[PDB]
Design a protein around this ligand. Structure first.
Ligand code: NA
Ligand code: NA
Length: 210
């Protein structure tokens, strides 16, 4: 099976086992509010900042360069959104990572330091393919349920991508064309499972008030 198909199959499997949470479900159906949305995006700034440091190192090494499109970068975008949500820049020195986010960030930093291309591609897949599918849709829900201004929703729009549907097809084809040893491939698939698990834990912690 192509890598894109195998990764879809690691996702699916990881969903069962996942610690169940209702944070995102509640958020998207209008049961929470702007505060809880802001808490999510503060955690996201931490992990997208870590992720993108890792992406930068792996790209600079010359691994998977075409997949690692800098137009995907979200961290600075999130910071601009948070400046709007919080009213100031202060939040940068005051946000505290949940225990799940600490563990996630620690993995992403280890990947950066090791310049681990296969592991980075796994995390890139888990974060960005989900973002490229869940966008305009989540943003609209935040506008509709909670009146969040578009100025605070820039995370959901990729300025550099004209045609999202085609972009996702190209992305999956780039995955299918990545040259990997059997060992790198096995490592990448394992890491994709781990990344999905980190992600579920972030939401479980948000759902506990952590
Ligand atoms: Na779940
Ligand atoms: Na959901």
């Amino acid at each position: 099976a192509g890598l894109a198909v195998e990764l879809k199959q690691s996702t699916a499997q990881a969903h069962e086992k996942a610690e169940h949470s209702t944070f995102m479900s509640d958020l998207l159906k209008g049961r929470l509010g702007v505060a809880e949305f802001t808490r999510l995006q503060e955690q996201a700034w931490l992990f997208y900042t870590a992720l993108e440091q890792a992406v930068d190192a792996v790209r600079a090494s010359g691994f998977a360069e075409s997949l690692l499109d800098p137009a995907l970068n979200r961290a600075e975008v999130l910071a601009r959104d948070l400046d709007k949500l919080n009213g100031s820049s202060e939040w940068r020195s005051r946000i505290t990572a949940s225990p799940a986010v600490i563990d996630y960030v620690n993995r992403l930093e280890e990947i950066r330091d090791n310049v681990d291309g296969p592991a980075l591609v796994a995390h890139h897949y888990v974060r960005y393919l989900g973002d490229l599918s869940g966008g305009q849709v989540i943003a609209r829900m935040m506008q509709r349920h909670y009146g969040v201004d578009p100025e605070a929703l820039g995370f959901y729009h990729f300025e550099g991508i004209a045609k999202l549907k085609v972009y996702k097809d190209e992305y999956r084809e780039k995955l299918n064309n990545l040259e990997l040893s059997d060992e790198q491939r096995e490592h990448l698939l394992k890491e994709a499972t781990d990344a999905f698990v980190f992600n579920h834990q972030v939401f479980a912690d948000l759902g506990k008030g952590l």
